[PDB]
Design a protein around this ligand. Structure first.
Ligand SMILES: Nc1nc(SCC(=O)NCCN2CCCCC2)nc2sc3c(c12)CCC3
Ligand SMILES: Nc1nc(SCC(=O)NCCN2CCCCC2)nc2sc3c(c12)CCC3
Ligand SMILES: Nc1nc(SCC(=O)NCCN2CCCCC2)nc2sc3c(c12)CCC3
Ligand SMILES: Nc1nc(SCC(=O)NCCN2CCCCC2)nc2sc3c(c12)CCC3
Ligand code: NA
Ligand code: NA
Ligand code: NA
Ligand code: NA
Lengths: 396, 396, 396, 396
């Protein structure tokens, strides 16, 4: 049981463990695309004596954080221990090695999508974005007098085949990802992958259709089994006009009873309708998990609320350093100190505050975040909040 | 089809329309309790030529708003039109008369619980609180190292019969309702009603049990049909210690698979657990709806965030007045003006912002709230936000 | 947290913990009946400082074992720890005290019905009987030419009201319980209880009917919710003729689609039919759990198979003694020895072998029962097997 | 309506009737494999005037019976009557002809898997093995201290692609089938067939994985529709160590909630766990059905329990002969007699006793097996019991 970077000979063994560990695994051909995002020394494998019993890797990602700042991000993925080698400390060993390589490479943050919500807290990952499924019974849906696009001067939205308008989707996404916290750069190979899932599979998924606006798109397909449910896989809108126009078109799918979308808690769709209740929340889950690798670099890189006035405190991260934290005019300075800590938290708690999806007051109430000053809690709360609501880009 | 205050002779006709309109209607005996909250001239009925075809009333309530301020509130309830007299403008007529009487009586706000989410917007009611059902699979639930009450020095929580500890529940609730936005005074007759539902009904609800702490209680019963689900009807905790202690006791119901509770979006329960995902959101809905009767009185009565610096604007409510609004040091001054409006909104939108449950930015994105200054939107956003999360007291 | 025998003042606190711990708890009035089976010093309670947080008791029972031998049996029941006092070692403390009192009182065996199958193994209880639910689709059920009661000379079975034929049910049960391993004496107060559940409850269970033969009875009721399913609560047959006759009558319930019964794996009902498959096994579970208190007394008290020839071995029970075991002519002699052990097992494994429901070979295969002689395993297997199949009398 | 052996020209008509009669029919290409097991004169067809309206065949099989003895067995299969020609006595005619050919060919036993449990009794087939579905909720599954493979010195089990380890599966199966009653020789063409079902089908079954030990294997796949259920198609273990090791690996499938397997009633899996109840029996059914063609040859060929002492009786099979039966030292001598019968049974009842899956006492209780001596019943019972539990090899 030794720990090594894989060679080309190890990947067939890794694909086997992948097939056996992940039900949603397309196969080696689609793995070519994702492999291009794995740097040299981005992967570890554990061999027994020999076959692959353990694997983990990170991908080179670009993550938008509040203030429209883009951070280099290590995206953890393809993490698996063989069912034959459980409870043997292989995960702890692989996650220790990758975090070493991620930190030494100068990534300020690591990110992952959690297969289960009970594993990643103790490796320093906190849930940072929230997935919100809205189902609309579109048979009752009437738009509000106040909603943009009331006047029937002409619809600016077109129904199109995804593959014939790739260029336009790319351009809209690129604009979207740069202006939204949780935004991720989508490289060319993941657009190739996305538009190949857009075509109908024999006894699988149905054909995907696109609704295209100059400043937004929706990709949607009818559900395999429920033929009265349309699933919106992706809706990217850069302006409120684009968002309303795309929803007017989706509510116009008169052959459907229901439109479902995985969105964020602050999606304005419910407020576009005369009856806010018609857009039911049918499912909620943690989206993206963050591990702050370098506390000073991460806190200094993001923008803060201009509304809160200048303030200073001392932040202790458990086994992560103690820092003089000074926030004002939407910037932070974060410097070493041995002065008494005013705020204590585990590293995962910091990951949860970093994109503004969770309130310091909420984590404080659970005692995940300790302070003896409630004034400082309110100030932390307001400073870390995000003007632009945090969204989730795409699963990796 | 004339509109009148009911006499004692009208109430049997009102109870008939009640039984036929509301499935969850206990009966006339329990109606005695609620009737004591209806002032003289709090009720209107419509007779045909004669039987009751239309009714509506308000109750005298006390509603905690941000800044721990208690407002006199007209609680609309018992609103019904006979199925024989639909689409005849009876609701519009009854709601016009009650709003006249509510305004003339000097209530700054009216409130209701909506039977359907598509009716009350056009009478000026906006959804102001959010109900959040959490279901815990308590078989996997482990408390976090950071959670209060780790040390087994002795449990401060007792399992008790509700009826034998009324005095203690009352005292805890009274403390809770005074310090939480959305808090309502619960008078003696509604405690009588609550503790009578606490006993087992023959081929109905099972016996309710209480978990009692010095600074919190939970009332819970096993579900009629699902014998592995415990439903928490009510959990009132004044301190974070009480909240954790009560949840440690509920997770200790080893005969149950699942604990469900209707709570608020900011419930810290998920952060008390090693796996935040174990507390799934199974249901979300609008709780309390507010109609601001008097815009200047309501905006001046509540406290604002001390974090946002002093700022001035002109607010126009559609058919509700135009006001010079000046916010600073957590207070607002709101005075008549004919100066150009910087913010426009329908009255219902104001009701939705009033308790801090919805963000101005979110309503702005749906065009429910118009401005041409995004700086003013952020300032509005931060000022109207509530330090203490908004909760829902009890249905009426 | 002290451990004491309850006084009359403690029982209201015990009934509260009962209501909160057991969903199927009738109430204090029916508890009078069961209380008469609890000896003086049969109960322990744990008080905190004061309320009941822990309880356990045993009842005086009489258990038929192979060879038609009746043993005095301590029936453990009413075991509960308050959800407020979990993971505090209250169960381990109460079970240690009761086992002390049971052993000192001279009970050779203790018995219980397990609320969950993961608790009782480490207190020395092994599952000893198996519950088998058969559902018959009685619309296809035709009796075999070979089945007794083919000739229509006249039915010896009567449809009757349970309460009017108590005397006859008692006499048949008394005959049944004396000749079947797992048989329990049913005292008068449990017949009072049984026949009170036989009457219809308002918005609860439907009326119970009886099928009465000179040498058998069935009690059955239609299911609350499924009106085409008849549930046989109890079928006691002393002769094969009685068993067939009762099943001919149940298959004649022409208003039902399905007859379900909780029976034992060796129920001959499937072999009475032309299509054995029509009697589906819809559910299987551990019935009665045994803890052998005194290994020598228990092994000497039961009869063994006359078919296996005389043989000698040394049995070690983990922390339970080592014994020279000599079996021949259906009797065992069991005497102290320090000679080398040929068979090792935990005490619970012995409880599982004691009524002949599990095979030594099966437990050996799981390594619950160690030996280095496979000849001795076959001999153990054959000797402990029961001529009369083991059944389950009634839940306690 | 004449009865004939098919020619090559008849097989397309037989495949048509197959497709229309059997939902699980792969097609003619996979039928090539099974056809190689059909001897010359192993098949009958009924033509009308012309198309195939009736068919039946037997395959040359090798069946392990108690005492590790292998019998030549006629495996009945591909039995179908056209829906156009029901209730015309075609089955009775085809089954009479095949049984003639089977008996004349010198097969001591015939075997089949029953499509329905109500047909085959009257042609002399009795159910001889029992299929037992266990579902494990593997999230709660903890292995017992006593279970082999506790020490984490290194896992002896490998996760592998089935097709790359055919040789090893074959060798383990061959060892297994020779030492277990109900074991069947699996020829090369059925290994070809098995490993072709092991690969993923487009919009069909998912990829099959193998867990490989030196002395056991498991083949498993995730369910089509339920992505949290793993179905074990096949688990062959020659030693108890192999059986435990394979189950430790399956419980380590951390992406699954449930593991299901079709096994036998005596599977020790439940005893490997701290909570025996976690391995629920979710389904039970007759496996293999036996028709004893030659009573003297079949009774003389199998081994008997060495534990029962020598005894003699006279067995009458209804329309099957009367025999002096003498059993001692695990052998039987079975010779013609006209002496008074002590045991009577139909031929199917003998098929049910032959592999030791049913007890003579159980069949006696249903009056399927008549005697006036209960001593002789116990002796029959013990003699026919199988030391090694009876399992089911594979469906044909
Ligand atoms: N990072 C990768 N993603 C995907 S698509 C599935 C997805 O979006 N989320 C679930 C991830 N989970 C399931 C399947 C893959 C493993 C983990 N496919 C692939 S192939 C491959 C990677 C990858 C990383 C490099 C090799
Ligand atoms: N305000 C009142 N509440 C209740 S209890 C039911 C509840 O909490 N919410 C649903 C209200 N809805 C159903 C039943 C009553 C009518 C509307 N019972 C009664 S009786 C009665 C009132 C009332 C108002 C005065 C007469
Ligand atoms: N031993 C007793 N049995 C019963 S009836 C229910 C039953 O048959 N099995 C489930 C037992 N379980 C549920 C309800 C009681 C507690 C445990 N009722 C009562 S009341 C009472 C006892 C008892 C023991 C003495 C006081
Ligand atoms: N004996 C044969 N088995 C099979 S695979 C299906 C199975 O294992 N059991 C269900 C059998 N039942 C369904 C499908 C076939 C007919 C009966 N396929 C084939 S093709 C073929 C035979 C056969 C016998 C010779 C021609
Ligand atoms: Na400071
Ligand atoms: Na101004
Ligand atoms: Na010996
Ligand atoms: Na004889």
């Amino acid at each position: 049981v030794t720990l090594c970077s894989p060679t080309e000979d190890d990947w067939p063994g890794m694909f086997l463990l992948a097939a056996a560990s992940f039900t949603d695994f397309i196969g080696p051909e689609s793995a070519t695309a994702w492999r291009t995002l794995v740097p040299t020394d981005g992967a570890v494998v554990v061999r027994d004596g020999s076959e692959v019993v353990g694997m983990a890797l990170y991908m080179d990602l670009r993550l938008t954080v509040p203030g429209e700042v883009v951070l280099p991000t290590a995206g953890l993925s393809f993490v698996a221990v063989a069912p034959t080698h459980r409870r043997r400390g292989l995960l702890r060993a692989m996650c220790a090695e990758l975090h070493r390589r991620i930190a030494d490479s100068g990534y300020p943050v690591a990110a992952l999508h959690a297969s289960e919500g009970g594993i990643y807290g103790r490796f320093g990952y906190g849930p940072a974005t929230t997935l919100h499924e809205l189902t609309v019974d579109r048979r009752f849906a009437r738009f509000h007098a106040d909603a943009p696009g009331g006047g029937l001067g002409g619809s600016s939205v077109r129904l199109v085949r995804p593959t014939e308008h790739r260029g336009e989707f790319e351009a809209i996404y690129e604009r979207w990802r740069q202006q939204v916290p949780g935004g991720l750069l989508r490289p060319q190979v993941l657009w190739d992958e996305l538009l190949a899932e857009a075509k109908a599979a024999p006894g699988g998924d149905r054909e995907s259709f696109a609704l295209l606006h100059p400043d937004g798109y929706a990709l949607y397909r009818v559900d395999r089994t429920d033929l009265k449910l349309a699933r919106v896989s992706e809706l990217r809108a850069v302006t409120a006009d684009a968002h309303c126009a795309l929803w007017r078109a989706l509510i116009g799918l008169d052959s459907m009873e229901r439109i479902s979308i995985i969105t964020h808690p602050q999606d304005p769709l419910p407020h576009l309708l005369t009856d806010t209740r018609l857009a039911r929340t049918t499912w909620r889950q943690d989206g993206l998990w963050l591990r702050i690798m370098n506390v000073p670099a991460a806190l200094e890189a993001r923008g803060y609320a201009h509304e809160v006035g200048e303030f200073s405190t001392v932040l202790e991260v458990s086994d992560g350093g103690r820092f003089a934290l000074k926030i004002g005019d939407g910037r932070a300075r974060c410097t070493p100190t041995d002065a008494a800590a005013e705020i204590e938290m585990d590293r995962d708690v910091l990951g949860s505050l970093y994109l503004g999806a969770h309130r310091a007051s909420t984590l404080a109430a659970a005692n995940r975040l300790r302070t003896k000053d409630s004034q400082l809690l309110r100030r932390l709360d307001a400073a870390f909040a995000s003007d632009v609501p945090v969204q989730t880009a795409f699963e990796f």
